[PDB]
Design a protein around this ligand. Sequence first.
Ligand SMILES: O[C@@H]1[C@@H](O)[C@@H](O)CO[C@H]1O
Length: 305
Amino acid sequence: NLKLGFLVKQPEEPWFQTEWKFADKAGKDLGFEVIKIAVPDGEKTLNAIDSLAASGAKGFVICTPDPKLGSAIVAKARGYDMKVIAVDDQFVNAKGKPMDTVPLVMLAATKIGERQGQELYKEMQKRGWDVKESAVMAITANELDTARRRTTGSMDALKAAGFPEKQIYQVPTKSNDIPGAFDAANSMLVQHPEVKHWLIVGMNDSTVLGGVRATEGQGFKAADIIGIGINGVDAVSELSKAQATGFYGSLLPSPDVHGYKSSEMLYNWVAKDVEPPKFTEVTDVVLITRDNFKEELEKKGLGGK
Ligand SMILES: O[C@@H]1[C@@H](O)[C@@H](O)CO[C@H]1O
């Protein structure tokens, strides 16, 4: 019957895999088919839209691989009389200004970053580290707004709790994955031999995990590393390991809400011209660690751990 696209930039992340599963549920409930397409670069993104048009889709939810493609995506969709909703990553114009007219569903980036820095600080205090020999490694992706509000939020929180600003070191990552973060973290680590304990800040689980893998290769044991990711679902294989690592826990948001609600809203828009809210910020978050990740995922219906 009705076909709707669900396009994501990183199909390998459990985060997006979960959005896809909940979109399928929305399709089962409301009576539409979801076409699941991977759009890891700009080219694929525009070609995928043409492909959706050929398939007869009336609209799509999309997590763009590049916010600056916003204009192009809007132009092509209009050309095909397709409605568009953005999930997680906001479209921006050439200048970098947000395209506020496109409905957006996303997590509360600032608030969850702040919660990341509060939980880092707390766990540091629990361990008794001497602040004088401690440092924060912030692995940033500042060209991505959502990534930038999380890492700024986290650094702001650490500063607000009393962590010395001069011991916060930032390093850019070229890709939002383990290899990009690994590389980034490694170059920062050799510049700071004086540090005995590291807090690793990054916008998501993969970034933090690459930071943690680099620390391991430079000789730090788990007690001297605290990394708290963001996404939850993406850290299950780490939390499931037999031995504890420097990856202490993850902040679990609601990818399930993002996949169903964006899909449901697209459908009401397509099927009834019910126009969606322009901005839907989901604030849900829970900290998962080795001790509770299974309880918490099951309690949220993201079962198996
Ligand atoms: O790439 C991140 C993704 O891993 C998830 O955290 C939602 O936001 C996107 O920007």
